[PDB]
Amino acid sequence: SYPIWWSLAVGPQYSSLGSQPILCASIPGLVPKQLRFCRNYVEIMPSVAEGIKIGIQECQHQFRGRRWNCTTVHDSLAIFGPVLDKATRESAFVHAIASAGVAFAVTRSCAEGTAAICGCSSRHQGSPGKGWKWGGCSEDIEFGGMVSREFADARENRPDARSAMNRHNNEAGRQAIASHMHLKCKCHGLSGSCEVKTCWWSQPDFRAIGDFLKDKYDSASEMVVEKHRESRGWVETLRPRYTYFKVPTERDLVYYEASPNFCEPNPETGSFGTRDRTCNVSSHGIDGCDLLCCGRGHNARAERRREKCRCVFHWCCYVSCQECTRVYDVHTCK
Amino acid sequence: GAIIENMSTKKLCIVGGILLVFQIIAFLVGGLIAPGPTTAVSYMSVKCVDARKNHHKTKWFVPWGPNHCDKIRDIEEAIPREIEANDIVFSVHIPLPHMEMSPWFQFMLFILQLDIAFKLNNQIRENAEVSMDVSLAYRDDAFAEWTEMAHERVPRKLKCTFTSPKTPEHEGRYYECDVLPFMEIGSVAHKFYLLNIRLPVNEKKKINVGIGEIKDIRLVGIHQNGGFTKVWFAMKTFLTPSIFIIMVWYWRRITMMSRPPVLLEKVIFALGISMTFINIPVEWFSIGFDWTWMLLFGDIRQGIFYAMLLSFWIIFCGEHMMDQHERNHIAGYWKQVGPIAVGSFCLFIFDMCERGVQLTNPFYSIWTTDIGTELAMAFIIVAGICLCLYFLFLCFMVFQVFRNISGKQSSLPAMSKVRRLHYEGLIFRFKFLMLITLACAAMTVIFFIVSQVTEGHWKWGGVTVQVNSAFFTGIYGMWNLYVFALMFLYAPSHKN
Ligand SMILES: CC(C)CCC[C@@H](C)[C@H]1CC[C@H]2[C@@H]3CC=C4C[C@@H](O)CC[C@]4(C)[C@H]3CC[C@]12C
């Protein structure tokens, strides 16, 4: 990748959801700003690593048949491998979804009561002061955004063309969540009539956020690098192509380098080959998997898998039903 | 001869000035001091696993803190661990960490929002219902065992739609489900509350089967802000002494007369009593005693005022036809008042049905079954028809009054000083109150529409103005001030 501390979501993660108080010890990519955060906001640190994990699972769902599947190497010093060392379209998505993942996980964890330092906390406040017992705590919805912008965007202020890209795409993730929240209202009063209406905003599901950014991925604009400074020196910023197209802000994804070829293995570009992949497992018709293999003759494997069948299927879990076997024909390519 | 008929135009302007100054203050207090009406807080439940321990020894499951439960982070983790349905309980601690409830919160409303996944083998059936096994406890201090408040069963219907095509590509997407009512508690008397919800499954009875795959439960808690209650009580405390004094002044003026009182005077006084009833801080015992019946009291008190205000307007119009009338008895307006008695009676039953059962079962909704819905709507429909009949009989009464005025205001040259001044006064007295009543109604309706559609607050410089709050304090003060003007201006004029 490009950020290192993302590796907390894999391997060593080992469900470190508060039972493993490893604080500012293992975080491998950390500047002075991140040190101050992780030392002051310890109860919420496990929710940041989980947020990254969520983003990883979503990108692997969203790109399951796009040649580049969001692969994560075992080194853990570079969670996605070198594929993200370039300012390409794939990086724009990974940055946006990771940013969204952190804000999402933090907000949910605060709603569960996993931290006493999340947003508002006071046991007293008569003298008028916008406290819990006088005015209410309405600032708790912006906390997840604070954590994502405070912790993640700490190395992104260096004057570099890539830094501009990263800042924009990370905000795109946070805005994707804000743009998809729903307004609900409860009507109550003298007889239930709407003399007092109380409204609240609810969080979207993360699948909707994934789909949104997937559409923005395909619609992503090309930018070029421009440099200037007042004093002797240069600062690199991006210039969107507004000669024909319409690039926006806080809604879209940006890039400025070309994506690699993902058909064949190439260790210098960070590209993993598609030589061993499957197809015709979705609609069993024509799908992206026909180009995935970049080859021909998708006919190689038969399987006899065992699965549970003839079940009642209760609302929760461990249905406890009978087993059976089925024969499958898998259009595996070489 | 009322006082308003002997005041010069100058004196009326002075009184109007004083009344306006108070109306401006009423708005300022609500906007600039009060924090706003209510707050909603969102909660996410924790999935605690009972290791086949809870049979009769009720063990209360605490989401977080010391002695926390063994919890599953994601429902899918249940399958590798062999955890079955009925062994998972959803725990919510109502106050958030390092927060407490206080008696100044007047009520709590609780609603649930289910997060249900779409899977091809687990779809929601046409008549899908969720049967919740719900227990609530209270605690006063951290180092004490939880004490039970309620244990009930809460069936609710599911209303869910799926907007994506139902094909093997969108599995894992959530249903779009509506909000389900859950609980109403009419008093806040304890610092801490603990809620445990279980969803038992029974295959042979279709209890929680075919209700989809449920992954999370969200709870929203709505309460009135403490600062809003404190300011509201201060306002009522100010008003009560003022209302009491004018009521006594009015009474003495009516009874110390050379002639018995008339019907309009009796009605104006009775309207004063209804407003005195709504201005008494009876709620200032809600901070010291756990009296769960205060929410229905509030409604009854408020409902009575409405009936009295609508009736006043009928009698007033009926008392100001010039020729052929000046009737003074109650038994003969039943043609115009009946609709009010029937409408209010039917609404009373509707509120009593919902509120009275809440007092004995906090997990109640009149809208749970088809029969309950049919009866609840029948009462609302009847009340609506009666209110429309009221509006048409008031409009005809007014029409007829005005045509009579056009007549009386024409044949003026042939009466004497005594009769001419009498009727000219009545004509003015009528027109004045009509213009004021319409202005008061217009302002109330327009500001209800600017409270139901705008954001709720406005940040302008260093001052944040609460708009929903200013609405409540301004209108509340307005009608009381209007009744104050009514008693002073329309009391008998003293003559020597
Ligand atoms: C202006 C005046 C006449 C209004 C009077 C309103 C009455 C009903 C109010 C004013 C002050 C109130 C009291 C203020 C404080 C307390 C302490 C609390 O722990 C129990 C309720 C109690 C004891 C209240 C009872 C009701 C009360 C007496």
Numbering used by the authors:
A (entry chain A): 19 to 352
B (entry chain B): 3 to 498
Task: Quote what the paper states about this structure.
WLS has been found to directly interact with Wnts throughout the secretory route initiated from ER, then Golgi, secretory vesicles and finally cell membrane. Wnt-triggered signaling pathways control many crucial life events, whereas aberrant Wnt signaling is tightly associated with many human diseases including cancers. The transmembrane domain of WLS bears a GPCR fold, with a conserved core cavity and a lateral opening.
In the overall structure, Wnt3a perches on the luminal side of WLS with several β-hairpin and loop regions (Hairpin-1, Hairpin-2 and W-loop) interacting with WLS extensively and generate three major interfaces. WLS looks like a grasping right hand that seizes one finger (Hairpin-1) of Wnt3a bearing the conserved palmitoleoylated Ser209, which is reported to be essential for Wnt secretion and interaction with Frizzled receptors on cell membrane. Wnt3a pinches WLS with another two fingers (Hairpin-2 and W-loop) at the luminal region of WLS. Intriguingly, we found in the TM domain of WLS there is a large hydrophobic cavity and a lateral opening between TM6 and TM7 that exposes the cavity to membrane environment. This cavity accommodates the extruding Hairpin-1 of Wnt3a, and one POPC molecule, clearly identified in the EM map. At Interface 2, Wnt3a Hairpin-2, containing Trp333 and stabilized by the disulfide bond formed between Cys334 and Cys335, extensively interacts with residues in a hydrophobic pocket at the distal region of WLS luminal domain. At Interface 3, Trp150 on Wnt3a W-loop forms hydrophobic interactions with Met101, Met103, and Phe107 in the loop between β-strand 2 (β2) and β-strand 3 (β3) of WLS luminal domain.
